[PDB]
Design a protein around this ligand. Structure first.
Ligand SMILES: [Zn+2]
Ligand SMILES: [Zn+2]
Lengths: 364, 383
């Protein structure tokens, strides 16, 4: 159940309820995970972060190669990874390490984790989902059209064929009865196919929609995006993949998109950087100017890193390649990014999102 | 006589086992105690809150590595190691002369101190006893160790190094101007030579330092020689001061050395997880579908949250994450072991604890290590 609080300038402020006691705020982000962990963080250290989203994103590409063990385990991937009470959305691809292109056919789609190719027909994909048992899952889809009208037309038909076949298999699956399929809008950069994908996918009883293939982010694709969301029903959530940088997030929110991946703060962490942009841009902690800097990463930040550690210490930890550097940067970068999403929702409540957008852009 | 930093809260009637308390500037430490290296925990992503939650109240700093990065001047500006690394409990640092120093980086020792080599025929660096104290003063650790002349080794060098360590002890004592703020420990030398070690014990205990460490063991020596030198050392070190046995950390070694009178211990990735029966090698295929934790009765975060199967999967597919979880559990095991040892001494049931520990670890007395059976028998503990 998606209930809107208000819609101002195309931006949807609301909550998704009955997830069946959980609620998720929109616009919002999903907690980013890799191989079933928030990167560099534990259950304990995740609990300390403020504003952790109500739903976490899992990636089939990092979990599909563990199918045999998960099927033996039977109780689902959330329980397997030690987060039995969390909500999980399982996407097809990882947005940071998506693997090689060109392996999509009318019959299967392939993903890569640590090891070898995992080729998934519809039945294999659904068999994997029966072991994972996520709360939400992206349907098998062809996202490589814009990676030619012919290629874009095929991505819509393949994705509609996958969708219908997966819905049929879900009807016969005891365990996937409580799981929600997310329809996937394809069509690449051909306007006619985007609309057809949008209109036809909305005819199917999906729990929501994934806007695939908008990664960058052109103004052409932003116009495709708004053209697509105008065709989708208002009472279902709109997810988008590969869009996480703050400026791009705001452009998509203005065009009716609700839920975003949070891989951007992870990318910042992996390059040894800390988010510093005001939301009411980043700093590189390897720089020698931080060697004697005993300020926190962000003055006034409430995260465990900033309240208890210095730039100088994090600089040292990076120079000696200690995993604690990535722990502390990840805690701060997630806390900062989740605080940014809190400020978006507050700005929508107060009708000041335009002002927040200029504050963000200013630091870009 | 200087004020004593230790008190004994219980002693085993038959054996040498002691339960004590060390009153240190950053808090009281219960003994016997195992002291992990702090920077080894931070290398594996362990925060101060996590290490505190495992029960750790004192950890080691390696002075040589600290002296390279970030260096003593930066640590001084950061108001000491406690401030720099956000650690509110106790720290113990070594002299910086030998621990974790490659022999490729060391020139020969002279009376003036230790000499470090720099790459490609560069200029050498001297670390005198006085400079070692000055560096550890800047670190601000709660316990500091003398500079000693460490040797691995037979012939006259052992006696020569032992006597130089006595002379350097006196120089460290003279240089250490603030015994109210940091506690300097002497380090007993003499190798496996009973006569040299006896002389070192007799001479170093004439110095009124607050504690004594036992050096030069944990080399290649036999186990027979090892435990006899530990027992010789504890028989001559003052009862009313702590005994720190360096470089001993295997569980069986720890338990036996507590029985011989030792109070403090230290010791430095293959998928091994410590358990009461020894270790589990979680990379083995048998754990791929083992959905139990490493140890159902381990209170560590890893055992509350994760199965052997999950850790096995991560050891292959996300190894860095696995190493965090395993390091947390392995430190937890060491701290729990020493906590269980101390409880048994307080409840006057240490010989029973040893018997149960050995039976769980090995089985029948005939499967226990012979050196351990003999060493324990020497303090009245029969298996
Ligand atoms: Zn912070
Ligand atoms: Zn454990």
């Amino acid at each position: 159940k998606l209930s809107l609080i208000k819609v101002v300038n195309g931006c949807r402020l609301g909550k998704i309820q009955n997830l069946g006691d959980c609620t998720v705020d929109i616009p919002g982000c999903l907690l980013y995970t890799r191989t079933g962990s928030a990167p560099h963080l534990t259950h304990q250290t995740l609990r300390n972060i403020h504003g952790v989203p109500g739903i976490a994103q899992l990636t089939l590409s990092s979990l599909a190669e563990h199918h045999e063990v998960l099927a033996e385990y039977k109780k689902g991937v959330g329980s397997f990874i030690g987060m039995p009470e969390s909500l999980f959305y399982c996407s097809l691809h990882d947005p940071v390490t998506p693997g090689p292109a060109g392996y999509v056919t009318s019959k299967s789609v392939s993903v890569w984790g640590f090891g070898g190719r995992v080729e998934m027909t519809v039945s294999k994909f659904m068999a994997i989902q029966e072991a994972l048992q996520p709360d939400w899952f992206q349907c098998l889809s062809d996202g490589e059209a814009s990676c030619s009208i012919k290629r874009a037309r095929k991505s819509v038909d393949r994705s509609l064929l996958f969708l219908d076949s997966c819905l049929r298999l879900q009807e016969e699956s005891e365990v996937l009865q409580k799981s929600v399929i997310i329809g996937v809008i394809e069509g690449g950069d051909v306007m006619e196919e985007r609309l057809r994908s949008a209109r036809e996918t909305a005819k199917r009883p999906v729990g929501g929609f994934l806007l695939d293939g908008f990664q960058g982010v052109t103004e052409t694709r932003l116009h495709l995006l708004s053209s697509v969301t105008a065709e989708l029903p208002e009472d279902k959530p709109r997810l988008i993949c590969g869009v996480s940088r703050p400026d791009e997030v705001l452009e998509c929110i203005e065009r009716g998109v609700d839920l975003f991946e949070s891989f951007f703060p992870y990318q910042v962490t992996e390059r040894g950087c800390a988010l510093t942009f005001t939301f009411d841009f980043e700093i590189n902690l390897k720089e020698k100017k931080y060697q004697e800097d005993f300020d926190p990463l962000v003055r006034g930040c409430s995260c465990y890193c900033c309240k208890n550690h210095t730039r100088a210490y994090i600089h040292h930890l990076l120079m000696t390649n200690e995993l604690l550097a990535g722990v502390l940067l990840m805690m701060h970068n997630f806390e900062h990014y989740f605080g940014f999403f809190c400020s978006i929702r507050e700005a929508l409540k107060n009708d000041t999102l335009a002002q927040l957008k200029e504050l963000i852009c200013r630091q870009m | 006589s200087a004020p004593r930093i230790m008190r004994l809260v219980a002693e085993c009637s038959r054996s040498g086992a002691r339960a004590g308390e060390l009153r240190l500037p950053h808090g009281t430490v219960a003994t016997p105690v195992f002291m992990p290296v702090g920077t080894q925990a931070t290398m594996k992503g362990i925060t101060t809150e996590q290490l505190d939650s495992l029960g750790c109240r004192i950890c080691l700093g390696n002075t040589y590595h600290l002296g390279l990065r970030p260096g003593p001047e930066l640590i001084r500006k950061a108001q000491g190691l406690h401030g720099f690394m956000n650690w509110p409990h106790n720290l113990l640092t070594d002299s910086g002369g030998f621990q974790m120093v490659s022999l490729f980086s060391l020139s020969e020792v002279t009376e003036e101190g230790v000499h470090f080599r720099s790459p490609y025929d560069g200029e050498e660096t001297l670390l005198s006893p006085e400079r070692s104290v000055e560096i550890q003063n800047a670190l601000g650790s709660d316990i500091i160790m003398q500079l000693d002349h460490v040797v691995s080794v037979t012939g006259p060098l052992v006696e020569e190094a032992m006597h130089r360590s006595v002379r350097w002890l006196d120089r460290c004592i003279a240089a250490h101007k603030h015994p109210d703020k940091q506690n300097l420990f002497a380090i007993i030398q003499g190798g496996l030579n009973a006569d040299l070690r006896t002389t070192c014990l007799k001479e170093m205990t004439k110095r009124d330092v607050p504690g004594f460490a036992i050096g030069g063991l944990s080399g290649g020596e036999s186990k027979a020689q090892f435990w006899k030198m530990v027992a010789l050392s504890t028989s001559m070190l003052p009862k009313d001061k702590p005994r720190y046995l360096m470089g001993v950390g295997y569980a069986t070694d720890l338990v036996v050395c507590v029985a011989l009178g030792c109070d403090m211990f230290d010791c430095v990735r293959f998928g091994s997880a410590l358990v009461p029966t020894g270790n589990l090698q979680l990379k083995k295929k048998q754990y791929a579908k083992d959905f139990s934790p490493i140890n159902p009765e381990c209170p560590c975060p890893t055992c509350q949250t994760h199965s052997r199967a999950f850790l096995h999967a991560l050891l292959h597919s996300d190894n860095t994450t696995a190493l965090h979880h395993l390091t947390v559990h392995n430190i937890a095991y060491q701290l729990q072991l020493l906590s269980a040892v101390r409880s048994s001494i307080l409840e006057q049931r240490f010989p029973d604890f040893v018997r149960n520990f050995m039976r769980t670890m090995y089985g029948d007395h005939s499967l226990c290590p012979a050196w351990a059976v003999e060493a324990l028998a020497s303090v009245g503990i029969m298996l």
